[PDB]
Write a protein that binds this ligand. Structure first.
Ligand code: MG
Ligand code: MG
Ligand code: MG
Ligand code: NA
Ligand code: NA
Ligand code: NA
Ligand code: NA
Ligand code: NA
Lengths: 1011, 210
């Protein structure tokens, strides 16, 4: 039948979808959510065999184990076990586009399990097997007999095995196909894997059972009263003695309860549902659920007899909250939300797409610890445990249907085709049927990147009809179609419009007020965090806070989809597209996370934490105004620590308890701050501390901070004149200066400081020269390739202009002897094919105190692409252990990504001044630095800098971080100016104009000396 | 104390070069013990009679951003024409110069003054690379205004008809000038991007005889 090549057949003998079941036979175990004897896990060691196609599978496999098979753990993706290669492709389908057909050579995974089944389970009731996730399609056999078929890799497929099981030993045979017609709807930008990657289990239900139940909570105007409504459905034989009791619990206290026989209200001319009943419980002053305070109640649903005998019980956590859009605003419990979200794929560097509780908990803690309050299930229903954790820890969730046809041309070719409506409807409807009772789910999504088709409108309306408690959104076809309650664009910029034909991405501020538009706007994806990114992140948040209808968005994305591979020596390394022989592929594009695959944070995460803070500050005189952005909670676990320091030197500090009502303000009067004697800049730094630990954070957790420049005293005191006098020495090839045990050598042929000596010891390995380029960031490269160049990408514009080829041409190199110093004057011209790109004019002034003052003045041709940087660089001979500096830090920060950085005195080990981005590029910069210390060296001024054992050249010639090798000495890049990193997206220039080096003329000065 | 600030000399030296003389100065403008600005300059006079002036100014971060950062002097000469290569021909400021065009402009001195009924800073021209007046010529990248009225007289006179041409010609050459604003005229209206808040400024001029 080749059911895997027919969108008309998405399953065979599959049971109806429903909320999580456990079939407890004891109401107390249900109330407490403890394990159930009726729900067994079949996870563990299974037998596995790989085949090139289903036609290659031997019939004997259905009867008994294949001796060639191996024993492997399940759940798992067979690519992670090495049976075949995982494929990383973004848009382009991994298979030829010829719906509904797939390749004849279709990798087939044959799983099998021999397991025991107790006679009691067969003597009565129904025994079903549940596959929470099988990628992408599969046939099931039990004890040699065919049971059924199923599709949709991200939702559970259930089958009744009651008639196939025997008391004792049993054997399951599961033939999993890598490709199927279902694959046409699973073109998400991620690794393409397969196998039984989610839990497998057996559930025993009585013949007369609870087959489904829906929980809803409605409120009065001030939420002081609520009505919990529970619709319960049953299957089996209906009798008058049957009853259903739904009880609501707060800990061990029962708050409400309702009981009724089956038999719903009349719905039409033929009557009502005899097999259904709706219980309605009144709740006074309910404790409301939110990501701020995840208050939960326990709802227990008991199917029992009139006389009180229990048949079975099911249950779920209940969160009393209302989600609605009113007057263009998305409200939660009557208050306008500000979504601090992030998109999160289910990814593990070692296990692939198999999820586990530990990893899920780790992600949630890091998310909340970094001020996120929402997550989008990009782009499919998640592992069931995920919603339970979000309910309890408190995170707003966007549950998304597993539908993405990005590779089609046009994108809506299938979604607008009525023949594909059946397959699509199952992915939407079964998702809703499974997760509708989770309070954390506040919005439904119709899928991702599948254009806009009539099928979307039909399914949008279906959801509004079955579940009016949640808004429905969908970005396809322009982000504001008739299939979305929320304008949810991806990568729309703050102020800049991107007028693409048919599907423009308007500036978000402009989008809101388009003629006739009234909906709220929340980006489903923004701030592409690929590599050294998130430049301009603060621009989004300033807009979110100023515009009521701009209610946030979800960053793209949480974690890099890098995979672990091992070298000849068995040492592990991070791999991406193409590293598994997979081709075609989209290389680095699978890595766009705020954290590495192992959950280690990228520098950008801190920028997100800062901009997403829940407390805002303003300074006026001695008064600090604290404003709360919390909607429901009071600041009852917050303390404000303040500190004043002069150039890193603390002068005063203290702490004040925070008592701010949600949306409220608090004024904190700082004590009389003493005036510092020494000259310099006084800085005020405040930070919110959480004294007590929480379920998501440790005691002392810092949730917010802010800095202000206070009084500044300019230094007007002249340095004590030194009686020493530098001595100049000349030769055809050099200008050398000598002062005490210090020597400076200027090559007259190159015009650069080629060497320095302190006690006759060389200080440089490479001359001090100007630098106007940087090892290209992912944002500089975009989608440009060696065989497919994107002339519009920054890197391509720099290359074409000759910025990387430019040769320094000496125009002047003079020397003069002053009264108490030596003055060296140079002038260079960087050209490319007769074109003068830059002109650098410098003056070096060495005095009797041994200090060398370098003054640089650069001219940039107005018609050459703006340079990535304007500074100097050299390879120092020294290799010290620490790097001490007075500037923005402690983490890596760039011009358009430095709001989170604080000004102070920082000291770190050299290794921390390098950011291990899987794909190497310019990195580790620190801006607004007034003083830098390394080894015996000290540089003073106002510059940006990075320092490491890797040259810009090696960084731009290496594709993977594990292939980098520490060079001799230490490479130092000191810039007077540095271009922004951008990030609004990573496939087109995204560096805002204000962060481009376009002034035409630049000036900066440095002072080099011995500490 | 911006209008009261007195210049305090911190340093003044001179040096002979293989082909020019170098003068180095450093001043500190203070008000009641508070250092508002620090100006460091170097004057380089070469065999061609051209004087190169390099200026580097530090502005205390806690003092209100200055209205301008430049130099001024009263020239003895009084010419009839003002010729310049920059934005013009009419008066233009940083936040009001889109209408101005870059080219070579030549106007009678009187047109370099805007007769606003209520006297104030006026007649500035931005993005100028070359300025010519009498035997003088200034080159670089600056903004400027030139007239027979000093900034002092302009701020002490309530009506334009009470202004009197002073001796010579007052020249204001700025490396930077604050925006004029105007969203309204009863509260600060100069946008942040047009306020001189960088903390440190640099500009260079070349003075010679045209
Ligand atoms: Mg099919
Ligand atoms: Mg896609
Ligand atoms: Mg800040
Ligand atoms: Na908003
Ligand atoms: Na991607
Ligand atoms: Na508190
Ligand atoms: Na590279
Ligand atoms: Na006046």
């Amino acid at each position: 039948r080749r059911d895997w090549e027919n969108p008309g057949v998405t399953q065979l003998n599959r049971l109806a979808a429903h909320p999580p079941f456990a079939s407890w036979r004891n109401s107390e175990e249900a109330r407490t959510d403890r394990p159930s004897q009726q729900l067994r896990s079949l996870n563990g060691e299974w037998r596995f065999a790989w085949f090139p196609a289903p036609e290659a599978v031997p019939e004997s496999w259905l009867e008994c184990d294949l001796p060639e098979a191996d024993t492997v753990v399940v759940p798992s993706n067979w690519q992670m076990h090495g049976y075949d290669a995982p494929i990383y492709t973004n848009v382009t389908y991994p298979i030829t586009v010829n719906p509904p057909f797939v390749p004849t050579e279709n990798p087939t995974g044959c799983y099998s399990l021999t397991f025991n089944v107790d006679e009691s389970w067969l003597q009565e009731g129904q025994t079903r097997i549940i596959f929470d996730g099988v990628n992408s399609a599969f046939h099931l056999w039990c004890n040699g007999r065919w049971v059924g078929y199923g599709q949709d890799s991200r939702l559970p497929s259930e089958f009744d095995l009651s008639a196939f099981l025997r008391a004792g030993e049993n054997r399951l045979a599961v033939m999993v196909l890598r490709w199927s017609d279902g694959s046409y709807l699973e073109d998400q930008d991620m690794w393409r894997m397969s196998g039984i990657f989610r839990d497998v289990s057996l559930l025993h239900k009585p013949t007369t059972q609870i087959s489904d139940f829906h929980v809803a909570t409605r409120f009065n105007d001030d939420f002081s009263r609520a009505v919990l409504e529970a619709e319960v459905q049953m299957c089996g034989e209906l009798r008058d003695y049957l009853r259903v009791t739904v009880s609501l619990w707060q800990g061990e206290t029962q708050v409400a309860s309702g009981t009724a026989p089956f038999g719903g209200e009349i719905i039409d001319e033929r009557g009502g549902y005899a097999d259904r009943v709706t219980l309605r419980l009144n709740v006074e002053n309910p404790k409301l659920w939110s990501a701020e305070i995840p208050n939960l109640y326990r709802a227990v649903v008991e199917l029992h007899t009139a006389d009180g005998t229990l048949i079975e019980a099911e249950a779920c956590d209940v969160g009393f909250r209302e989600v609605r859009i009113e007057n263009g605003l998305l409200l939660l419990n009557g208050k306008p939300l500000l979504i601090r979200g992030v998109n999160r794929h289910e990814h593990h560097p070692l296990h692939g797409q198999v999820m586990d509780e530990q990893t899920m908990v780790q992600d949630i803690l890091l998310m909340k610890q970094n001020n996120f309050n929402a997550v989008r299930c990009s782009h499919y229903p998640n592992h069931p445990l995920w919603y339970t954790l979000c309910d309890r820890y408190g995170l707003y969730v966007v549950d998304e249907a597993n539908i993405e046809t990005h590779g089609m041309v046009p994108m809506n070719r299938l979604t607008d085709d009525p023949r594909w409506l059946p397959a699509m409807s199952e992915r939407v409807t079964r998702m809703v049927q499974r997760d509708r009772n989770h309070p954390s789910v506040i919005i439904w999504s119709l899928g991702n990147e599948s254009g806009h088709g009539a099928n979307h409108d039909a399914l949008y309306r279906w959801i509004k009809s079955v579940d009016p408690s949640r808004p429905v959104q969908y970005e396809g076809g322009g982000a504001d179609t008739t299939a979305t309650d929320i304008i949810c664009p991806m990568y729309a910029r703050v102020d800049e419009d991107q007028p693409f034909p048919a599907v423009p991405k308007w500036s978000i501020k402009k989008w809101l007020s388009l003629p006739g538009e009234t909906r709220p706007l929340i980006l489903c994806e923004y701030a592409h965090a690929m590599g050294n990114s998130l430049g301009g992140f603060a621009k989004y948040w300033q807009a979110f806070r100023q515009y009521p209808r701009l209610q946030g968005g979800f960053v793209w994305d949480w974690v890099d989809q890098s995979l672990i591979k091992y070298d000849e020596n068995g040492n592990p390394w991070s791999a991406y597209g193409g590293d598994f022989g997979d081709t075609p592929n989209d290389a680095q594009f699978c890595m766009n996370g705020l954290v590495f695959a192992d959950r280690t944070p990228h520098p950008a995460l801190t920028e997100a934490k800062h901009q997403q803070q829940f407390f805002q500050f303003r300074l006026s005189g001695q008064t600090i105004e604290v404003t709360s952005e919390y909607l429901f909670r009071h600041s009852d676990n917050e303390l404000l620590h303040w500190m004043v320091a002069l150039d890193g030197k603390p002068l005063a500090s203290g702490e004040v308890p925070l008592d701010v009502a949600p949306q409220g303000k608090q004024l904190i009067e700082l004590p009389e701050l003493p005036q510092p004697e020494s000259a310099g800049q006084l800085w005020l730094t405040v930070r919110v501390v959480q004294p007590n630990a929480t379920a998501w954070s440790e005691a002392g957790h810092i949730s917010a901070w802010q800095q202000w420049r206070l009084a500044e005293n300019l230094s007007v005191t002249l340095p004590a004149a030194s009686h020493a006098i530098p001595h100049l020495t000349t030769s055809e090839m050099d200008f050398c200066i000598e002062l005490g045990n210090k020597r400076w050598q200027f090559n007259r042929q190159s015009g650069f400081l080629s060497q320095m000596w302190i006690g006759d010891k060389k200080q440089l390995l490479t001359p001090l020269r100007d630098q106007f380029t940087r090892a290209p960031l992912d944002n500089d490269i975009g989608v440009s390739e060696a065989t497919r160049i994107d002339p519009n990408a920054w890197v391509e514009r720099w290359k074409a202009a000759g910025h990387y080829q430019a040769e320094a041409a000496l125009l002047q190199c003079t020397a003069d002897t002053l009264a108490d110093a030596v003055l060296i004057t140079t002038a260079h011209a960087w050209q490319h094919q007769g074109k003068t790109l830059f002109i650098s004019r410098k003056t070096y002034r060495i005095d009797g105190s041994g200090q060398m003052a370098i003054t640089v003045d650069v001219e940039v041709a107005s018609d050459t692409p703006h340079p990535a940087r304007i500074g100097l660089n050299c390879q120092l001979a020294q290799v010290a252990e620490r790097v001490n500096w007075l500037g923005l830090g402690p983490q890596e920060n760039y011009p358009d990504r430095l709001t989170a950085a604080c000004f102070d005195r920082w000291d770190l080990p050299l290794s921390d001044m390098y950011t291990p981005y899987v794909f190497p590029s310019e990195n580790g910069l620190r801006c607004g630095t007034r003083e830098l210390n390394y080894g015996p060296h000290q540089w003073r001024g106002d510059f940006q800098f990075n320092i490491s054992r890797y040259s810009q050249q090696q960084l731009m010639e290496t594709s993977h971080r594990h292939l980098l090798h520490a060079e001799e000495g230490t490479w130092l890049n000191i810039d007077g100016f540095h271009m922004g990193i951008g990030g609004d997206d990573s496939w087109s220039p995204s560096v805002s104009a204000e962060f481009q080096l376009s002034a035409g003329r630049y000036h900066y000065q440095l002072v080099w000396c011995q500490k």
